[PDB]
């Protein structure tokens, strides 16, 4: 299962 | 070494003037692709690409689909930001790529986590092996580094790589038992190719092997042969197995004095091959 | 400045024997950026039912794709893969050699 998104760059 | 890995590969590509960036994801266990997502599909959703992941129920697929739809938006913001850090125009297309996942040993515990990024095909920023710090490639990436530090992003990442990634991998290895635990040894054979004169090519084949890691050498008495060898890039057969060949010209009147040596996980012992007319 | 040109291999899934069903593969790798056009050709003509793998990439961030199609080879028909990419000034055509 993919990770939930992080903060943007 | 019943050791294993899971990886996700993300590619986001901008398309100025033609709407949002395209977002594509693929996931792998070892060298087996098992899922995909494409934001351009008529109905974007995570989809199965291996037989053993189909046993997951519809809530699995919907959850992942939500994650990728959110990730797509995140990566769009990132692409907007990066265009600005490099002072690039608004008309051009650019690429943000991500790769992450975990390596585990036979006990199933984390050996190494990864999470890193490339912008326009070049390293941008990477989570270091301690899963607590970052390496930035240039002064633009240091801007992102400062955001990532400020927000303690490495903690959420660590939580995923230590606490989720390894457990999902364990689960996929249970779903796929046979196909993922079993190596497929190469079917092998040497062919004779006359450069129709006074010297010919021997090409040593290896077909139908999994995983992709293989070594094919030509060599004399423990000592190498490469006066001229062509060794092709390992390539997928398309049924989840791989292929490779190595070749050499020898003084072929009858200098069938050179041998082909194959190493591969699925081979109990290294093998040694010779031409048979 | 950050564009890498595609490598191309053309080959079949199984050792070709004439009149027996098989798969024709065009494996393109090492390229950047990801837009690419590839055609499988039968005696110069574009084959219509052609599929490809999901976009992925290698350790150096360069992309790879496998294009493929059912075919049944003959001693007489010849097959090639035609690739266009931003790093190429004209399409590159690679013929299928059944011994490679």
Numbering used by the authors:
A (entry chain C): 1 to 9
B (entry chain A): 0 to 276
C (entry chain B): 0 to 99
Task: Quote the passages of the study that discuss this structure, keeping the authors' original sentences.
We next analyzed the structures of HLA-B*07:02, HLA-B*42:01, HLA-B*42:02 and HLA-B*81:01 in complex with the well characterised RM9-Nef epitope. Pro2 and Met9 acted as primary anchor residues and Arg1, Val4 and Arg7 pointed away from the groove for potential TCR interactions. Despite distinct selection pressure at position 1 of RM9-Nef by HLA-B*07:02 (R71K), peptide residue Arg1 was in a similar conformation in all 4 HLAIs. However, the altered conformation of Leu6 in the RM9-Nef-HLA-B*81:01 complex, compared with the other three complexes has similarities with the conformational switch described above in relation to TL9-p24. Leu6 was in an identical position within HLA-B*42:01 and HLA-B*42:02, but moved by 3 Å in HLA-B*81:01 and 1.5 Å in HLA-B*07:02. These differences were mediated by polymorphisms at residues 156 and 152 within the α2 helix. The larger side chains of Arg156 and Gln152 in HLA-B*07:02 pushed Leu6 up compared to the smaller side chains of Leu156 and Val152 in HLA-B*81:01, changes which may be linked to the L76V/T/I selection that is mediated only by HLA-B*81:01. The other two major differences in RM9-Nef peptide presentation were located at the junction between HLAI residue 147 and peptide residue Pro8, and between HLAI residue Tyr9 and peptide residue Pro2. The smaller side chain of Leu147 in HLA-B*81:01 formed no contacts with Pro8, whereas Trp147 in the 3 other HLAIs made multiple interactions with Pro8. Finally, these data demonstrate that a substantial alteration of the conformation of peptide residue P6 in the HLA-B*81:01-RM9 complex is, as with the TL9-p24 Gag-HLA-B*81:01 structure, associated with the differential selection of escape mutations observed in vivo.
